[PDB]
């Protein structure tokens, strides 16, 4: 028994918290991850690199405190510890926002180990892969959104930052700035989540209320052995149900459940590929037709423009306090805005 | 035997291949008119003086929308909560003008709806199933119902609901935030859990029966074909993806009961759904998302802001500039 | 007037071992016959607090 | 009977309670600064 | 307790979630004084 | 506020309305002991 | 279908348990409550006491600017 | 001062009352 | 009965449902509830009389239940002022000493007294099914619910009357003499459109209105009282509806869903009933007020507020509504059908009347346009008063904000609970709300439908 195949048994013990060789990589960088993040929120700054409060020793409370991106200043630097910004201080590295990249970046290396992880377990116990197929679309979504969009962008800054109203933040700039609703990969990414959530929803509600009578309980939930061959709903009643209730059914379990895979896992990449067209402001903008006629015909006057009317608004406002690196100066005079308000 | 009978036991009928039943002798009618009345005037109604001011919104395709930015326009806010149907108007083009098909085709909807509840329930009730698919579909009606009435109604007017358009919604969404801060109000955080999760388990249960199929079938013919309809056989192995299951996270964290699986998946996004219709509709009467601009002051006194004042400069950017022309007091109350 | 404040602390104080008290004796069928008369006099002794309470309400 | 105490799942357990323990400490102690 | 040498689990949970309970609530109050608290 | 004679239970009426949420919480407290039968 | 170690409920429910844990609980507790109580967690990570966001010198954000010198450009700003 | 003091000893007493009957009950016999 | 899962066929989550056909405990459960609901009512009161601060209105420190006894005339005067505030604590003693009896009777019927009573009493023993005794109990409780609302009535009439907000010399505390019986009035009211301008019976705007449709109601619930008790159930009753425990408690859920969302939108729109006084101003009344406080600034400063035109082309502070009347402009256009004791003096037969607002405008109605339109029902979920995008210094939710919305959703998960107990009930009493009996499963029956 040479010494890997032993390392190989040890790791992949039955024990409480399986560890394997994909656990070499996820367990450290995710601990690293989620500790950052913890740190940053309970204890950091982000007054050098937003002139923001983003931790909880600062008076900010959980929807307020982030793992803010760092300073614009350093452009898409990494931003190591002992990289030539930090230089090996500690609470300068702190201060100029490493946390922020030590985070992106252990949770890249966290999420790839765990689809490993994905694929360790499947092949040990002796099932298809789809898992990690599936998870394969959260994936698209944090490369997109967290390193693809920034790379594309002038630094790191403009990355999400790890808090919720830094993730707030960061949706309402892309509505401003990018016009990300009438994206029309954004759409096909909503599609696939409320899908994937009606999908949820309704196969839920048809198999238990379509359940066959295999106990004498009220309580139907011990009426299931794991171990039972026969099918614990009847799907010859629910396909009727379907049919005659809104016309079309599935009839096919295994279509079902691949459909309830694909469903959610298409929209997160397609709005994957939406948010790399943002990274190079490749946006979905305008409609330059409407844009001409408004121009032209000052009675023409769609929803679409009245949107981006608010765009515009949001960006004059917010500018300032969300770029201070620019020095963004605007007289109140310049500020767009409607009568009496 | 009578003929009362009769058509009772033909609207009843589970033999019909779409249920009619009582409920569905509501929704057919009301909801072919929401339709035919939506499709007519997404296509030409001329424009609609939404805001009161005369200053008329083109939301057909004859007006130079795409499929965009076309709309059926909420009716004026000169009408306010008032009902307008077509025969209170002097005349059909001052129906139209002031956005009467809005009002047709959201009241018939809304009754269809309700109505298409009921009939799931009466559904069920004819096939000898259990009785709350219908209350699972309580959530996306409440939603509907949250933003095409009980918002109109809290804010005071119809011209308050949402349009029937895809730019026309992302309006009343951004307007909605600058005015209620929804993302700060945790119903909507909720709401973005039941949908986030709804899709995160519809994904790993789909994964997961997909993983665990039974081979019946070979690498050339679709997996699909390996289930009949109507066998009572298992067509996956709920013990491998139990066994998969609890080895990814840890073995309590796994079920292994179908049914409280499938309890699970029903739940939690109708639930979820529930939570962000209640935000709604209690932003409805202005009780809204939280507020911390300037929550953070420094020792001397000064603000120190957070990504919580950045947001509600994004906000104040969406209010100054929402319908321009429309205010004339400094506060916007109404 | 010192009088209605020590009414009223008395009346919370049996208030509290009412609260506690009665779910213990009506919850245990065994010591149901020294704590079903306990029960009564209780009772009546809260009750009287609080009439207690109520006439040095008019006199404080 | 007679298990093992130190495991795998000690040290996981422990990994995460600890400095979750700590942290809350500190934020408590946070809730009464003063400006 | 009622059986010696262990304590009821129903008697560490209600120990552990009036804990948990306390700490919510110290934070819920902290966001009314001290830093955060507008004031 | 409340009346002058009344004011050393003041602290006392200002924890009183909640008691019927203890009340939810003792239900689930009563059905752990019990091991949720 | 346990896997080896002793399940939590036994653990949870033993006394030798709570004579450990009665202890190190608390301790942890009161230690992140000094690092915070002591100024000790405004020193390590930098973050600034409320007196200290602005100077009686610079009344503005001091926003990084420099590329690679940022220890300097800290101090300067305080 | 102590009107915080005060609340909260009366707020832990409320607290353990339901408790302390609750595992009385059960400690004594009682019927649950 | 039994209290577990084997012996109940329940689990512990549904525990309740255990009490179904134990009549004994079921009533135990109940009389404890009740006194929960008593309790809390004679807590919350005592702890908003603690933190009242009688010279600072009602609705600028969380009170809701402050102004419905204020509302019924106890502790308050002239233009709502605070005179007595012992009414307000005894009300609030009361209901917490008959809560304490409450819960011990509650306490004694769930947990000692007799399990069922159907074997002690013919007359508290009933049986689900018993349509007889369950119309009986519908009797007897419609004779208490008009004895209520006489008492509503008596309270109004003879024992120091009710708050009227359309009082003339000012909104005080009046007695009504002449309350409306005419039918025609109080079931037209039932009859007006649930739309703007009509506002079914939230546009109720008169305590003689309100006192009279008590009359009405106490008449009406104490003769269906009588009819139930000495009447069963008709065949067309029997034949269409569930006679079921469950089925029972679904009725009335649907019944409490529709209340919830009619008192919702009450104090949402309605200030007769709830006094602008007690409960701050509606929605519709601060965006008036604040038209009216522009309109009455920029007339002392020279405009000439009838022929201002707006930006828009429409007139600045005055225009007229779709049906010709004289209305406040701007976005308050839509809620010209507003009527306050405040505006109602400038209001002529055409609507806003020029010369009223040239020369009858008051200092008081100067200074009521300005407290409404700051107290405009607008507020953060942390209680920071003012549109959404002002900072932290205002600590304001109007009391109707919080009712209204509390009872929304109270309404829509009462209806989620009406929805869950009827279809529940209609499947157990066909027998198959445990699940499709493999043997006989409907739809292996049924032709294939296509
Ligand atoms: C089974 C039965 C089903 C029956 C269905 C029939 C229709 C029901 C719903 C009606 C829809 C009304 C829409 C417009 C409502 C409105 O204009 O406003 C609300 C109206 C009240 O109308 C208002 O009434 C007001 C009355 O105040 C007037 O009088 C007052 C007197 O103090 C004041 O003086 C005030 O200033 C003055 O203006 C004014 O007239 C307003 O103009 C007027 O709009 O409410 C009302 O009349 C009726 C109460 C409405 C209840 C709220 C809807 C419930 C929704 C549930 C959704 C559930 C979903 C679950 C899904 C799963
Ligand atoms: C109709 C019910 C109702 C309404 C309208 C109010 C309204 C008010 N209360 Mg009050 N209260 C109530 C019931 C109510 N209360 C009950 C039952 C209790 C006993 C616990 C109290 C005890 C109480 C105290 C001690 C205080 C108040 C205070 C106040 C004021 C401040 C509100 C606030 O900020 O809270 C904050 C809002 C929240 C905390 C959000 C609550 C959200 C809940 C959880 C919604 C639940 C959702 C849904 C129903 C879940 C079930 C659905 C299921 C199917 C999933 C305000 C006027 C304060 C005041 O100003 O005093 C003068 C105050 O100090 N109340
Ligand atoms: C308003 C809330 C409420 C009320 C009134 C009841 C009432 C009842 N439930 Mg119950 N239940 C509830 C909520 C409620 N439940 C909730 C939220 C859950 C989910 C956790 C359950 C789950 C549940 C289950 C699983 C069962 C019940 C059962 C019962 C019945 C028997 C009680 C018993 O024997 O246990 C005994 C408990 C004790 C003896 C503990 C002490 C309780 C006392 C009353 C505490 C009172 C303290 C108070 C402050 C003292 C004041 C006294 C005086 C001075 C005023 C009873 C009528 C049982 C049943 O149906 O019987 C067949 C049953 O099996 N319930
Ligand atoms: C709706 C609530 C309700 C109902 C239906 C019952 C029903 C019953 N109780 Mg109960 N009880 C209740 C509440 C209720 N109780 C409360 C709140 C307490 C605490 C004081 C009690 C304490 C109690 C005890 C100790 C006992 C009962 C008993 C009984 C049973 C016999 C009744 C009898 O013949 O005595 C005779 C009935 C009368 C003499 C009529 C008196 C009516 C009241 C007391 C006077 C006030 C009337 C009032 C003006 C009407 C409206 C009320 C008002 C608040 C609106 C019976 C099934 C007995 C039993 O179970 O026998 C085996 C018994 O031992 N009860
Ligand atoms: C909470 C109080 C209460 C309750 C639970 C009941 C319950 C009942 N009553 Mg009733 N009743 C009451 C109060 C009450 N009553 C009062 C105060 C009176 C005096 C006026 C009556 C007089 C009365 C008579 C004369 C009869 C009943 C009957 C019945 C039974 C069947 C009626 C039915 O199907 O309901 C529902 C009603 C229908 C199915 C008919 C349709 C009604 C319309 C179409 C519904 C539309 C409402 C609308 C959508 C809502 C808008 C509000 C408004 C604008 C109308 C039933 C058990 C019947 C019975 O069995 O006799 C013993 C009967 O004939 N009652
Ligand atoms: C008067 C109203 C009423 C009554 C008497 C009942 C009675 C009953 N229901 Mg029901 N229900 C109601 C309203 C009511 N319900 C409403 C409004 C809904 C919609 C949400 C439901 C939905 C419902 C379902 C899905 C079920 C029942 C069931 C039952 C039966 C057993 C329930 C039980 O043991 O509770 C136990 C109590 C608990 C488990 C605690 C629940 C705690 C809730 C979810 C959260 C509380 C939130 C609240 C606002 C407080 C916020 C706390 C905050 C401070 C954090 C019982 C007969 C069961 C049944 O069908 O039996 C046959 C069942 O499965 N009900
Ligand atoms: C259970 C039974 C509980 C008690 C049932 C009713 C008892 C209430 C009697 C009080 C009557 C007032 C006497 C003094 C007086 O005349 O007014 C004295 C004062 C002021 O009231 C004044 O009365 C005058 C008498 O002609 C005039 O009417 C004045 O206009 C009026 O202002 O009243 C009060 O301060 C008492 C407030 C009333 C509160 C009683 C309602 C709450 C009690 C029931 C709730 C518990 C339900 C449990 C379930
Ligand atoms: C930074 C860094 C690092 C790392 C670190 C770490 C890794 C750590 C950590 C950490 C951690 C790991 C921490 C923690 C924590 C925690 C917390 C803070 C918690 C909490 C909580 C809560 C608050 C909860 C609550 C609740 C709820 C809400 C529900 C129910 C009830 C309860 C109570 C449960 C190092 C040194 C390497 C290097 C440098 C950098
Ligand atoms: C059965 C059951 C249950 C329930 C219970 C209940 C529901 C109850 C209740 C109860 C109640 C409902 C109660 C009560 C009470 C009361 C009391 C005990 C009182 C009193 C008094 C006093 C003492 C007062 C005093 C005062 C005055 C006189 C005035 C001034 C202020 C003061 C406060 C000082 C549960 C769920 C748990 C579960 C199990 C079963
Ligand atoms: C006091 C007052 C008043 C009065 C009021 C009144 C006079 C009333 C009434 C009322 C009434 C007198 C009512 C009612 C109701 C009814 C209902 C709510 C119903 C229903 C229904 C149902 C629920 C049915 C169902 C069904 C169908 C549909 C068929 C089949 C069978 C069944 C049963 C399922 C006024 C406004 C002047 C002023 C304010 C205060
Ligand atoms: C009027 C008055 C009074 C009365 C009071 C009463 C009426 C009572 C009570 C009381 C009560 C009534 C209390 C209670 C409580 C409680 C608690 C503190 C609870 C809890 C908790 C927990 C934490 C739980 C947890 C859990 C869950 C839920 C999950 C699973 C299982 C377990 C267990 C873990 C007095 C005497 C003071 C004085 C005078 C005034
Ligand atoms: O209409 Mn459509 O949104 Ca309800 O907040 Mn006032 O109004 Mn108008 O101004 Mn912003
Ligand atoms: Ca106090
Ligand atoms: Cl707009
Ligand atoms: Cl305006
Ligand atoms: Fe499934």
Redesign the pocket.
Known sequence: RGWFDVLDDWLKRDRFVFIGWSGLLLFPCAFMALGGWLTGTTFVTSWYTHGLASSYLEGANFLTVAVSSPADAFGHSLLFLWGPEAQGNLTRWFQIGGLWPFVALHGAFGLIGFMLRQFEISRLVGIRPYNAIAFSGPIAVFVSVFLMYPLGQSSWFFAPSFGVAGIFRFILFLQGFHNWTLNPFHMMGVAGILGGALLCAIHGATVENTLFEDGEDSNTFRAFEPTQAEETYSMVTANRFWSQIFGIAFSNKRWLHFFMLFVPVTGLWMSSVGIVGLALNLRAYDFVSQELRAAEDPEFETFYTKNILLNEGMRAWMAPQDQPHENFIFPEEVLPRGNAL | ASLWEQFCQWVTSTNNRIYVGWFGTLMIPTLLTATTCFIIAFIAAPPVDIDGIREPVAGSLLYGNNIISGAVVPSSNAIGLHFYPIWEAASLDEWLYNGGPYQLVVFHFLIGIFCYMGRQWELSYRLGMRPWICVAYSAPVSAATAVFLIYPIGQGSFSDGMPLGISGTFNFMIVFQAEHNILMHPFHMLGVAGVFGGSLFSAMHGSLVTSSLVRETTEVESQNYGYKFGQEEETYNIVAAHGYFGRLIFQYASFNNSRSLHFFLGAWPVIGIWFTAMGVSTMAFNLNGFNFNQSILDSQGRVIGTWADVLNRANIGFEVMHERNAHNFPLDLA | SIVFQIALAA???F??????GVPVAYASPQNWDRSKPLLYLGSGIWAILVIVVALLNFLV | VTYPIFTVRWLAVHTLAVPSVFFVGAIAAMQFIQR | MFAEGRIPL?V???????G??GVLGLFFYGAYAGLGSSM | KLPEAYQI?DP?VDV?PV??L??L??A??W???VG?K | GTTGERPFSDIVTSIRYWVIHSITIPMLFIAGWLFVSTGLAYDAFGTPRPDEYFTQTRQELPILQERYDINQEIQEFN | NLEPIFQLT?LG???????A?VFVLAFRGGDL | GGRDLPSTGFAWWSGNARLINLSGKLLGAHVAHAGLIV?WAG?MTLFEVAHFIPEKPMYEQGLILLPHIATLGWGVGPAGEVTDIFPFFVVGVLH?IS??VL?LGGIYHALRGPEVLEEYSSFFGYDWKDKNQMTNIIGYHLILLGCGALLLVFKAMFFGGVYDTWAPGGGDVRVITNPTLNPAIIFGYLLKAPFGGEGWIISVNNMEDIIGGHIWIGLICISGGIWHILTKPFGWARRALIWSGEAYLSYSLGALSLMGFIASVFVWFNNTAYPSEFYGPTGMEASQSQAFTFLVRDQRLGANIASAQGPTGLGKYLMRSPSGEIIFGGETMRFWDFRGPWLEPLRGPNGLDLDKLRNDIQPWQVRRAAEYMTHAPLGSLNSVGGVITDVNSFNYVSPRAWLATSHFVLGFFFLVGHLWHAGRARAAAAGFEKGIDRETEPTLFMPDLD
């Open positions: 009346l919370v104080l208030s509290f071992v009412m609260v506690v | 129903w560490v949970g209600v120990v552990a979630g009036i948990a309970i | 239970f006392l009183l008691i019927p203890f009340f919480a003792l689930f407290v059905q752990a002991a949720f | 009366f007493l409320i607290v353990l009352a339901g408790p009957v | 309790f807590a917490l809560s304490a819960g």
